[model samples]
Target: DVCPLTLGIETVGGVMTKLIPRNTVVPTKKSQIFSTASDNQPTVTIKVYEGERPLTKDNHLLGTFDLTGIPPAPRGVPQIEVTFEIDVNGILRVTAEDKGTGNKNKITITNDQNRLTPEEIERMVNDAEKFAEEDKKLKERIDTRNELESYAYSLKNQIGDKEKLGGKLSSEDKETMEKAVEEKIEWLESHQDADIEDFKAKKKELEEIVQPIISKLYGSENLYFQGSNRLLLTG
Candidate 1:
């Protein structure tokens, strides 16, 4: 119901008249051709309006277009064409051209009606939610993996060299680090799983003993270490 009237222009007798009249289904385009009422009339005034009234005075003047360059001949010699197009949002457009001179005129009518189909809105929302969920899952997986890798690397860096463990670890330091590693390895072997807490604690304990030598090998606070149930190694 919120649409511009559909109207068509035609020549009836010696006067220009309307074929189809407005306030109809839009998102459509149509065209009509008519002869000029008088020959050699280089200019034609095309009046456009939107209303149920038949008189121009009673209708709402939407716009006006003037076309020129008609063939210089007697009455009804030159052909004039008009095309009307309306979009989904109920906006209107009119184009007029004189066939003889190829002069063209165009105008647009804007209407205050716009709406999105339910399916379109739903599809957009679903796509947005799906993207958000996918991003969250990807981030979580990366965070978990990085956490494990960081802990493993930190523990390995703190252990220093197993061959030089004799000089590096005092009896107490060696026992603490060794016991922590043994416990973690036993848990890993029995459960076939690496617990984050166990790795975290072991890494912390091992780092205390290797703290002094850590920068010498790793060259930074960014520690990376490698150790197993049998021995610990560092870069």
Candidate 2:
């Protein structure tokens, strides 16, 4: 997919603000004003970026241009105009000119190819994997909690109805089923470190034991389960 190139410009007194934000259409232009750091400053350097941060180093700098020939005056007295234009290809073109002195400088910022250096790519992949693992653990905790809530809700009404459980189950089976309700709650509380895949495996084992009991009590009329492919779940 093609991505747009966004840019920003900064001038004296660390006035680093954005001129063009991301998602802007190609071949766009933005301009802003900046003042000198001191009265009658001789020149100003325009620093620019390709990212969302206000700090110059946190983002990619397209380039810097210097404007000169300002008459000596008090700080903030001289006005500098900075214009940033980006083309459809995401290339940044910057122009900085001194309005008072009529002096101007311009530079085109080409794309930085070094961003995809092998070391950087490896580090990025490692970070992504770490984030994925954390998310998996969080999702598992949430699913287990939900399962416990559903089980608890059903266990209340079933506890007093041993006779209705059908002759296929014994009194001992009723005790075991009650124990499972407690176990599910404890399992949810203790399994915070488990990942989603591990939790799903455990859930499958528990479901096999519980589903028959539930179907006998609640009937299959309203109990339907659906399993989906991973692609379908995520897509």
Candidate 3:
């Protein structure tokens, strides 16, 4: 339940936005939306840290990534969302996306110095059982929220670029994609009481429709979009 670091943007004086607070339950996901700090900013560097220090440089460096392909726009015009997830095994996945372009980048940490050992994980799991029911409920909510946010982020990006997509997709197909995205977004907004599996199913359906278009726009060879939240790169 410890935050690995004070995660945040580095360019704006490395001000940290702690998406997941210290002592949060495991198997969780959290997100924060951010924006460009300058006009026509096309890239953002996300720095990960693992300590209680006030300064980012003083914290342990876990990982860093630059999210490119953001459409050129004034500072704060493009919405960037960053999500952090830790699975039951303590594997951490950090994903960042340009909500305007659906351009995304992620990093997975399995063996970093901050990672827990097998014995430590076993001990924590045993201790976690004391709050099993409460933790399970919290984890379920976290997963649902993450899925909904990820879906909405991708859908908004695609809808914004529908004109460009029209060049590759027929009018009928384009309309269909737009309608699907709109419908799902409405459902996500109004259906917070729905089951986690329901949200996941809907999210996957939209992803299957929008992913190929994203691949066509961004090149599938360079980036691989796996099911749901897993994004992998070939190089």
Best by TM-score: 3
* Per-candidate local distance difference test: 0.49, 0.55, 0.61
TM-score order of candidates, top first: 3, 2, 1
All predictions: root-mean-square deviation over Cα?
32.3, 22.3, 12.5
Q: If candidate 3 were superposed on the true structure by all CA atoms, what would the RMSD be? A: 12.5
Question: On TM-score, who's better, 1 or 3?
Answer: 3
> In terms of lDDT, which candidate is stronger, 1 or 2?
2
TM-score of 2: 0.45
lDDT of 2 by residue, 112-167 (tens): 63244556445544544556666455545555544443444344334544444433
Model 2 residue 17 CA deviation (Å) reads 1.2
lDDT of 1 at 73: 48
**Model 3 bad stretches (over 4 Å):** 1-11, 111-235
- Clashes by residue pair, model 1: 5-22, 5-23, 6-22, 156-225, 156-226, 157-224, 157-225
Please provide, for model 3 over 107-190, each residue's C-alpha lDDT reduced to its tens digit, 9 standing for 90 to 100.
887746566556755554454456567656755655565546555544445445545444556655667778877788677667
Q: Which pairs clash in model 3?
A: 1-23, 4-50, 5-49
Q: Rank the candidates by lDDT, best first.
A: 3, 2, 1
For model 2, state the Cα shift of residue 108 in Å.
Answer: 1.0
Q: lDDT score, residue 136, model 3?
A: 62
